[PDB]
Subunit: 129 residues, 2 copies
Protein backbone atom coordinates (compact mmCIF):
# COMPACT_ATOMS: atom_id res chain seq x y z
CA UNK A 1 0.00 0.00 0.00
CA UNK A 2 1.67 3.18 -1.28
CA UNK A 3 0.87 6.59 0.15
CA UNK A 4 1.85 10.12 -0.90
CA UNK A 5 1.40 13.68 0.38
CA UNK A 6 1.68 17.24 -0.96
CA UNK A 7 1.81 20.54 0.86
CA UNK A 8 0.33 23.26 -1.32
CA UNK A 9 1.73 26.77 -0.91
CA UNK A 10 1.84 29.97 -2.95
CA UNK A 11 2.46 33.71 -2.61
CA UNK A 12 -1.12 34.38 -1.55
CA UNK A 13 -3.05 32.73 1.29
CA UNK A 14 -3.74 29.58 -0.71
CA UNK A 15 -2.54 26.52 1.14
CA UNK A 16 -3.55 22.95 1.74
CA UNK A 17 -2.60 19.37 2.33
CA UNK A 18 -3.42 16.66 -0.17
CA UNK A 19 -3.12 12.94 0.54
CA UNK A 20 -2.70 10.14 -1.92
CA UNK A 21 -3.32 6.43 -1.37
CA UNK A 22 -3.02 3.48 -3.71
CA UNK A 23 -3.55 0.01 -2.28
CA UNK A 24 -2.98 -1.93 -5.53
CA UNK A 25 -0.41 -0.77 -8.11
CA UNK A 26 -2.61 -0.27 -11.20
CA UNK A 27 -5.53 0.20 -8.81
CA UNK A 28 -7.26 3.61 -8.48
CA UNK A 29 -5.58 6.37 -6.44
CA UNK A 30 -7.60 8.08 -3.70
CA UNK A 31 -6.77 11.73 -3.27
CA UNK A 32 -8.22 13.75 -0.42
CA UNK A 33 -7.60 16.70 1.85
CA UNK A 34 -8.41 20.39 2.04
CA UNK A 35 -7.26 23.64 0.51
CA UNK A 36 -7.82 27.09 2.01
CA UNK A 37 -7.45 30.60 0.64
CA UNK A 38 -9.62 29.98 -2.41
CA UNK A 39 -12.27 32.07 -4.03
CA UNK A 40 -15.52 30.19 -3.74
CA UNK A 41 -16.24 28.22 -6.89
CA UNK A 42 -14.51 25.74 -9.14
CA UNK A 43 -10.70 25.71 -9.29
CA UNK A 44 -8.62 23.65 -11.70
CA UNK A 45 -6.58 20.82 -10.15
CA UNK A 46 -3.50 19.49 -11.93
CA UNK A 47 -0.33 17.44 -11.63
CA UNK A 48 2.50 19.05 -13.63
CA UNK A 49 5.41 17.24 -15.24
CA UNK A 50 8.23 18.58 -13.05
CA UNK A 51 8.76 18.60 -9.32
CA UNK A 52 10.68 21.83 -9.89
CA UNK A 53 9.69 24.60 -7.53
CA UNK A 54 12.73 26.84 -8.05
CA UNK A 55 10.34 29.45 -9.43
CA UNK A 56 7.30 28.39 -7.46
CA UNK A 57 4.56 26.90 -9.63
CA UNK A 58 5.97 28.66 -12.70
CA UNK A 59 8.77 26.09 -13.02
CA UNK A 60 6.44 23.11 -12.68
CA UNK A 61 6.24 22.66 -16.42
CA UNK A 62 3.23 21.39 -18.43
CA UNK A 63 0.25 19.34 -17.36
CA UNK A 64 1.65 15.89 -16.64
CA UNK A 65 1.06 13.54 -19.55
CA UNK A 66 3.19 10.40 -20.26
CA UNK A 67 -4.08 14.94 -19.53
CA UNK A 68 -2.97 12.19 -17.16
CA UNK A 69 -2.22 14.92 -14.66
CA UNK A 70 -5.73 16.32 -15.07
CA UNK A 71 -7.51 15.67 -11.79
CA UNK A 72 -10.53 17.85 -12.61
CA UNK A 73 -11.66 20.72 -10.37
CA UNK A 74 -11.97 21.44 -6.67
CA UNK A 75 -14.72 23.65 -5.15
CA UNK A 76 -14.24 26.39 -2.55
CA UNK A 77 -16.92 27.11 0.10
CA UNK A 78 -17.77 30.55 1.55
CA UNK A 79 -14.78 30.58 3.92
CA UNK A 80 -12.86 29.77 0.74
CA UNK A 81 -12.31 26.20 1.84
CA UNK A 82 -12.22 23.27 -0.55
CA UNK A 83 -12.66 19.73 0.73
CA UNK A 84 -10.98 17.46 -1.78
CA UNK A 85 -12.05 13.89 -2.13
CA UNK A 86 -11.17 12.25 -5.43
CA UNK A 87 -10.60 8.77 -6.75
CA UNK A 88 -8.59 8.79 -9.99
CA UNK A 89 -7.75 5.72 -12.05
CA UNK A 90 -5.46 7.42 -14.56
CA UNK A 91 -2.75 8.65 -12.16
CA UNK A 92 -0.55 6.34 -10.09
CA UNK A 93 1.98 6.16 -7.25
CA UNK A 94 4.19 3.79 -9.18
CA UNK A 95 5.17 2.78 -12.67
CA UNK A 96 4.50 4.55 -15.94
CA UNK A 97 1.93 7.10 -14.60
CA UNK A 98 3.69 7.70 -11.30
CA UNK A 99 3.14 11.23 -9.93
CA UNK A 100 5.55 11.05 -6.98
CA UNK A 101 8.21 13.69 -7.29
CA UNK A 102 5.97 15.83 -9.47
CA UNK A 103 4.11 19.09 -8.75
CA UNK A 104 0.47 19.47 -7.65
CA UNK A 105 -1.22 22.79 -8.46
CA UNK A 106 -4.58 24.40 -7.85
CA UNK A 107 -5.41 26.96 -10.56
CA UNK A 108 -7.21 30.32 -10.35
CA UNK A 109 -9.83 29.34 -12.90
CA UNK A 110 -12.06 26.31 -13.34
CA UNK A 111 -11.05 23.64 -15.79
CA UNK A 112 -13.89 23.22 -18.26
CA UNK A 113 -12.31 19.90 -19.19
CA UNK A 114 -12.50 20.67 -22.88
CA UNK A 115 -16.31 20.97 -22.63
CA UNK A 116 -16.61 24.76 -22.43
CA UNK A 117 -18.53 25.30 -25.68
CA UNK A 118 -15.54 26.01 -27.96
CA UNK A 119 -2.63 31.98 -12.62
CA UNK A 120 -1.44 29.04 -10.54
CA UNK A 121 -2.29 29.99 -6.96
CA UNK A 122 -0.36 27.31 -5.04
CA UNK A 123 1.83 24.28 -5.58
CA UNK A 124 3.88 21.59 -3.86
CA UNK A 125 6.04 18.60 -4.77
CA UNK A 126 4.30 15.27 -4.32
CA UNK A 127 6.22 13.21 -1.84
CA UNK A 128 6.17 9.84 -0.15
CA UNK A 129 4.06 9.36 2.96
Amino acid sequence: ATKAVCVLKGDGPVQGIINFEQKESNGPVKVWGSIKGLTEGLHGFHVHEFGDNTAGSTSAGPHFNPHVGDLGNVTADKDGVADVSIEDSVISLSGDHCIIGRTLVVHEKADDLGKGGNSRLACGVIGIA
Copy 2:
Protein backbone atom coordinates in the same frame (compact mmCIF):
# COMPACT_ATOMS: atom_id res chain seq x y z
CA UNK B 1 14.46 9.93 -13.98
CA UNK B 2 17.87 11.55 -14.69
CA UNK B 3 17.71 14.89 -12.81
CA UNK B 4 16.19 16.15 -9.58
CA UNK B 5 15.94 19.47 -7.81
CA UNK B 6 15.14 20.41 -4.25
CA UNK B 7 14.31 23.83 -2.80
CA UNK B 8 15.38 23.92 0.84
CA UNK B 9 13.34 26.20 3.06
CA UNK B 10 12.72 26.41 6.79
CA UNK B 11 11.31 28.78 9.39
CA UNK B 12 14.59 30.63 9.74
CA UNK B 13 16.83 32.18 7.08
CA UNK B 14 18.22 28.89 5.76
CA UNK B 15 17.33 28.36 2.15
CA UNK B 16 18.87 26.80 -0.90
CA UNK B 17 18.46 24.95 -4.11
CA UNK B 18 20.07 21.55 -4.59
CA UNK B 19 20.53 19.61 -7.81
CA UNK B 20 20.76 15.89 -8.51
CA UNK B 21 21.87 14.23 -11.70
CA UNK B 22 22.19 10.63 -12.68
CA UNK B 23 22.42 9.88 -16.37
CA UNK B 24 23.17 6.24 -15.91
CA UNK B 25 20.75 3.96 -14.12
CA UNK B 26 22.34 2.82 -10.87
CA UNK B 27 25.31 5.11 -11.63
CA UNK B 28 26.83 7.65 -9.27
CA UNK B 29 24.56 10.55 -8.40
CA UNK B 30 26.02 14.03 -8.72
CA UNK B 31 24.70 16.55 -6.22
CA UNK B 32 25.42 20.26 -6.38
CA UNK B 33 24.15 23.69 -5.46
CA UNK B 34 24.26 26.28 -2.72
CA UNK B 35 22.64 26.92 0.64
CA UNK B 36 22.67 30.26 2.48
CA UNK B 37 21.47 31.41 5.91
CA UNK B 38 23.75 29.06 7.83
CA UNK B 39 26.10 29.58 10.75
CA UNK B 40 29.72 29.22 9.58
CA UNK B 41 30.82 25.64 9.93
CA UNK B 42 29.73 22.04 9.30
CA UNK B 43 26.07 21.14 8.84
CA UNK B 44 24.60 17.68 8.44
CA UNK B 45 23.18 16.88 5.02
CA UNK B 46 20.70 13.95 4.81
CA UNK B 47 17.80 12.53 2.88
CA UNK B 48 14.92 11.73 5.27
CA UNK B 49 12.35 9.03 4.53
CA UNK B 50 9.13 10.97 3.85
CA UNK B 51 8.30 13.70 1.37
CA UNK B 52 5.94 14.83 4.13
CA UNK B 53 6.28 18.52 4.89
CA UNK B 54 2.90 18.87 6.61
CA UNK B 55 4.79 19.92 9.76
CA UNK B 56 7.84 21.53 8.13
CA UNK B 57 10.90 19.40 8.80
CA UNK B 58 9.06 17.79 11.76
CA UNK B 59 6.93 15.46 9.58
CA UNK B 60 9.87 14.53 7.30
CA UNK B 61 10.49 11.31 9.29
CA UNK B 62 13.72 9.44 10.13
CA UNK B 63 16.93 9.46 8.10
CA UNK B 64 16.01 7.49 4.95
CA UNK B 65 17.27 3.93 5.33
CA UNK B 66 15.38 0.90 3.94
CA UNK B 67 22.24 5.54 6.43
CA UNK B 68 21.49 5.46 2.72
CA UNK B 69 20.25 9.03 2.98
CA UNK B 70 23.43 10.35 4.61
CA UNK B 71 25.19 12.72 2.23
CA UNK B 72 27.76 13.95 4.76
CA UNK B 73 28.06 17.61 5.72
CA UNK B 74 27.90 20.89 3.93
CA UNK B 75 30.22 23.63 5.05
CA UNK B 76 29.05 27.20 5.47
CA UNK B 77 31.60 29.99 5.01
CA UNK B 78 31.92 33.29 6.88
CA UNK B 79 28.95 34.70 4.91
CA UNK B 80 26.93 31.66 5.96
CA UNK B 81 26.95 30.16 2.48
CA UNK B 82 27.75 26.54 1.63
CA UNK B 83 28.66 25.54 -1.94
CA UNK B 84 27.83 21.87 -2.38
CA UNK B 85 29.52 19.55 -4.81
CA UNK B 86 29.20 15.88 -3.95
CA UNK B 87 29.20 12.51 -5.64
CA UNK B 88 27.29 9.72 -3.95
CA UNK B 89 26.97 6.25 -5.40
CA UNK B 90 24.58 4.85 -2.80
CA UNK B 91 21.59 7.12 -3.51
CA UNK B 92 19.70 7.00 -6.77
CA UNK B 93 16.93 8.59 -8.74
CA UNK B 94 15.49 5.09 -9.24
CA UNK B 95 15.18 1.66 -7.68
CA UNK B 96 15.45 0.64 -4.01
CA UNK B 97 17.50 3.68 -3.08
CA UNK B 98 15.35 6.14 -5.03
CA UNK B 99 15.31 9.49 -3.23
CA UNK B 100 12.79 11.16 -5.50
CA UNK B 101 9.72 12.07 -3.46
CA UNK B 102 11.73 12.12 -0.25
CA UNK B 103 12.93 14.94 1.94
CA UNK B 104 16.34 16.62 1.85
CA UNK B 105 17.40 18.36 5.06
CA UNK B 106 20.33 20.39 6.32
CA UNK B 107 20.86 20.07 10.08
CA UNK B 108 21.79 22.63 12.77
CA UNK B 109 24.75 20.79 14.21
CA UNK B 110 27.47 18.96 12.31
CA UNK B 111 27.42 15.28 11.47
CA UNK B 112 30.53 13.47 12.71
CA UNK B 113 19.75 18.39 16.21
CA UNK B 114 17.21 20.90 14.93
CA UNK B 115 16.53 20.67 11.18
CA UNK B 116 17.22 24.12 9.75
CA UNK B 117 15.71 23.63 6.31
CA UNK B 118 14.06 20.94 4.25
CA UNK B 119 12.45 20.17 0.93
CA UNK B 120 10.90 17.45 -1.17
CA UNK B 121 13.10 16.07 -3.94
CA UNK B 122 11.30 16.35 -7.27
CA UNK B 123 11.81 15.37 -10.88
CA UNK B 124 13.67 17.98 -12.90
CA UNK B 125 14.07 15.78 -15.99
